[PDB]
């Protein structure tokens, strides 16, 4: 199937307590592989997956250089945002950035991303055509005008369609045993009476990879959207993921309910019934 590489950065200002802390992480699909933390002692991009540890000293030198440069850029950007938004120098603010690319099963470029958020809301983003920007508000429109004039998009376009793609394909090959695997969910149901007339059914999916999955409850074959409690997919810690969906049902009527599980590791969706 297709694959993605994403880098996520978070800069947080802390007036009084020194310069903004900058943390960056890199992922291929749902597997993290690098990190950088401006507060850490090393001041280095660091490995966080076994298949990247093999990269030579020059890799680690260059990546560290690149990510430190980003760190300074977003430090400057935080100060500019203060100005644009007419905000006090006393407050703490957040600048987040995400970039990366998707490739098809044949390694071909599929899409590129380059986007920013300020205090948790869209600021500016490169559109899919990789030639234009979408600005969220009047402040970001200032940036948009500057970046259009300076042709900032053309560069990003390049990296996105070149370096980014090459890196992903390289990582996908080196980490083949990890990254090109699918682990199907192991499923089960639990059941707990909650009163004399109602019981909980909980449908579990465990040990699956990648994280994408769909769990749906039906009653007599009809989806039960609004009454299902569905938790966010969560990491097990071993590189696989977990999820459950529960419904409260009238006691004695458990058999009317079916849980449906869809995941790329399953040839056919599973149906579970208590």
């Amino acid at each position: 199937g297709s694959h993605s590489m994403r880098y996520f950065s978070t800069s947080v200002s802390r007036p009084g307590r020194g310069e903004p802390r900058f943390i960056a992480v890199g992922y291929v699909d749902d597997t993290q592989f690098v990190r950088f933390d401006s507060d850490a002692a090393s001041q280095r991009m660091e490995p966080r997956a076994p298949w990247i540890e093999q990269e030579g000293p020059e890799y680690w030198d260059e990546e560290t250089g690149k990510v430190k440069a980003h760190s300074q850029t977003d430090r400057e950007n935080l100060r500019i945002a203060l100005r644009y938004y007419n905000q006090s120098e006393a407050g703490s603010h957040t600048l987040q950035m995400m970039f990366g690319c998707d490739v098809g099963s044949d390694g071909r470029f599929l899409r590129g991303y380059h986007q920013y958020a300020y205090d948790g809301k869209d600021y500016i983003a490169l559109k899919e055509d990789l030639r234009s920007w979408t600005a969220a508000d009047m402040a970001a429109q200032i940036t948009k005008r500057k970046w259009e004039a300076a042709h900032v998009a053309e560069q990003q376009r390049a990296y996105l369609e070149g370096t980014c793609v090459d890196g992903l394909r390289r990582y996908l090959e080196n980490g083949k045993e990890t990254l090109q695997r699918t682990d199907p969910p192991k499923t089960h149901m639990t059941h707990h009476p909650i009163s004399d007339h109602e019981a909980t059914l909980r449908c579990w999916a465990l040990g699956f990879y990648p994280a994408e999955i769909t769990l749906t409850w039906q009653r007599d074959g009809e989806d039960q959207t609004q009454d299902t409690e569905l938790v966010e997919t969560r990491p097990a810690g071993d590189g696989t993921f977990q999820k459950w969906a529960a419904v409260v049902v009238p006691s004695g009527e458990e058999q009317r309910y079916t849980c449906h599980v869809q995941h790329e590791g399953l040839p056919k969706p599973l149906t579970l019934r208590w």
Partner: peptide
């Protein structure tokens, strides 16, 4: 590979 403009 990480990427190689101010607001």
């Amino acid at each position: 590979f990480y990427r190689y403009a101010n607001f």
